Design an enzyme around this catalytic site. Sequence first.
Site, short mmCIF file in Angstrom:
data_model
loop_
_atom_site.label_atom_id
_atom_site.label_comp_id
_atom_site.label_asym_id
_atom_site.label_seq_id
_atom_site.Cartn_x
_atom_site.Cartn_y
_atom_site.Cartn_z
N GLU A 35 0.83 -1.21 0.00
CA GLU A 35 0.00 0.00 0.00
C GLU A 35 0.85 1.25 0.00
O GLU A 35 0.54 2.22 -0.72
CB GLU A 35 -0.91 0.04 1.23
CG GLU A 35 -1.99 -1.03 1.13
CD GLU A 35 -3.13 -0.66 0.14
OE1 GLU A 35 -3.10 0.46 -0.43
OE2 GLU A 35 -3.97 -1.55 -0.18
N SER A 50 -11.71 11.16 -3.55
CA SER A 50 -11.25 10.85 -2.21
C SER A 50 -9.74 10.60 -2.26
O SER A 50 -9.17 10.52 -3.35
CB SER A 50 -11.96 9.63 -1.66
OG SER A 50 -11.71 8.48 -2.49
N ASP A 52 -6.33 8.46 -0.31
CA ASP A 52 -5.84 7.44 0.64
C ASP A 52 -4.63 8.01 1.40
O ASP A 52 -3.76 8.64 0.80
CB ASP A 52 -5.40 6.17 -0.08
CG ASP A 52 -6.51 5.52 -0.85
OD1 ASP A 52 -7.68 5.69 -0.48
OD2 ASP A 52 -6.21 4.81 -1.82
#
Length: 129
Positions: A35, A50, A52
């Site tokens: 990630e 959005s 992260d």
Amino acid sequence: KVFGRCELAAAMKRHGLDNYRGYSLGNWVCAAKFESNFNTQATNRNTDGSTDYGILQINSRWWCNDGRTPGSRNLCNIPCSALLSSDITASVNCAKKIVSDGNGMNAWVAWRNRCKGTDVQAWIRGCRL
Ligand SMILES: [Cl-]
Ligand SMILES: [Cl-]
Ligand SMILES: [Cl-]
Ligand SMILES: [Cl-]
Ligand SMILES: [Cl-]
Ligand code: NA
């Protein structure tokens, strides 16, 4: 901060993620690697607007407030910027909420596509835990 593999594993173990909801520690280390490359300052914008945030790439659509994702929720009750801290407490506490919501670690696309079904204990091999 960019963590080392075993440094992160120890921090995650101290904060209670080893076998949390049945996910052994190596799952969490594997997900963080793909990630964010273990970088607490990682950010990535999604197609819907959005963003992260942080070492586990937690999304502002549901989990934190960044002031720029209209219509979104803040289920971890935290500013997204808190997820970028060198101390991973906020990220871990929020991840515990996410993984408890029903989809388990499938909430992290990188976990599902790169960690699930693999030998995840390899990610904590050699660490002193
Ligand atoms: Cl493991
Ligand atoms: Cl890669
Ligand atoms: Cl917002
Ligand atoms: Cl599960
Ligand atoms: Cl891979
Ligand atoms: Na939000």
